[PDB]
């Protein structure tokens, strides 16, 4: 939590440059400075109050260019500034933050599906590669709980995945965890309480409305209430103890629906709608602008 839910980029017909922020306290949306380059399949995160947009791909009428970019948005100035780029382009990337360091995980570059992982140091403005995952994964969901980073699901070039793994920084090592009950690429992955949640995604045949959570202590995956809408390539974030899912694709429409999950009642409700339907957005939470 911090204040507003920011959604950056996305896709509808082509990649988008929108940056818009939703205030759950009053229902309003603000349109803010556009990204320098349109991108879908990116991930967002926040460190030190600043919003970062990482990776993705610019699908435009004249080209599909995978991105190795890291760009930072300062709400105090309503401006984007480039940062050092990653070692390699990464579309349909997963990102997590551990103690102020940004981990960029997996993703694709053309037909290459990465298992590589790299870590960004904001004050030093540098990226360095760390140990790669045990599995190549694009459309991978990533979240951090208790300073351990989890990469969940995705697609390896051949099969969509129900597997997941965890990175232990002090040993720079990855280990498989219990796999999910359901194959999911493009799921929204986040952390709430002591669990890693995987909502939606695509199982090889259908966009999903199911949601399951991994208890890091018991090592089990348990389904919770399903979302009202089936969605793959959705954005997700947690704010004030509730999960918010934004957009995605349901096999028919690029959704403008934003649903919110309340873990106390185990229910999802429709809470607002984005200004236009889109999938493949980056999402994160930070202070309101200006």
The CATH number of domain 1-290, selected from 3.90.79.10, 3.30.420.40, 2.120.10.80, 3.40.50.720: 2.120.10.80
Beta bridge partners of 116: none
Structure obtained using: X-ray
Place of tokens 């720079």: 172
Domain boundaries, the chain: 1-290
Q: What is the resolution of this structure in A?
A: 1.6
Strand partners, 82: 71
Backbone angles phi, psi at 253, to 5 degrees: -135, 150
């Amino acid at each position: 939590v911090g204040r507003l839910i920011y959604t950056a980029g996305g896709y509808f017909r082509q990649s988008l440059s929108y940056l818009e922020a939703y205030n759950p306290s009053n229902g309003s949306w603000l349109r803010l400075a556009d990204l320098q380059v349109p991108r879908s399949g990116l991930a967002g995160c926040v460190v030190g109050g600043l919003l970062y947009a990482v990776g993705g791909r610019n699908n435009s009428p004249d080209g599909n260019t995978d991105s190795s970019a890291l760009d930072c948005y300062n709400p105090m100035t309503n401006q984007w500034s480039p940062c050092a780029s990653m070692s390699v382009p990464r579309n349909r990337i997963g990102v997590g933050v551990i103690d102020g360091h940004i981990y960029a995980v997996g993703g694709s570059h053309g037909c290459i599906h990465h298992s590589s992982v790299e870590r960004y140091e904001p004050e030093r403005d540098e990226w360095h590669l760390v140990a790669p995952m045990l599995t190549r994964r694009i459309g991978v969901g990533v979240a951090v709980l208790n300073r351990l980073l989890y990469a969940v699901g995705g697609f390896d070039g051949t099969n969509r995945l129900n597997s997941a793994e965890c990175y232990y920084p002090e040993r720079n090592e990855w280990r498989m965890i219990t796999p999910m009950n359901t194959i999911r690429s493009g799921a929204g992955v986040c952390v709430l309480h002591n669990c890693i949640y995987a909502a939606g995604g695509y199982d090889g045949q259908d966009q999903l409305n199911s949601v399951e959570r991994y208890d890091v202590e018991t090592e089990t995956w348990t389904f919770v209430a399903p979302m009202r809408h089936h969605r793959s390539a959705l954005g997700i974030t947690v704010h004030q103890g509730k999960i918010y899912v934004l957009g995605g694709y349901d096999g028919h429409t690029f959704l403008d629906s934003v649903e919110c999950y309340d873990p106390d009642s185990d229910t999802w409700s429709e809470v607002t709608r984005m200004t236009s339907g889109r999938s493949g957005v980056g999402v994160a939470v930070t202070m309101e602008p200006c």
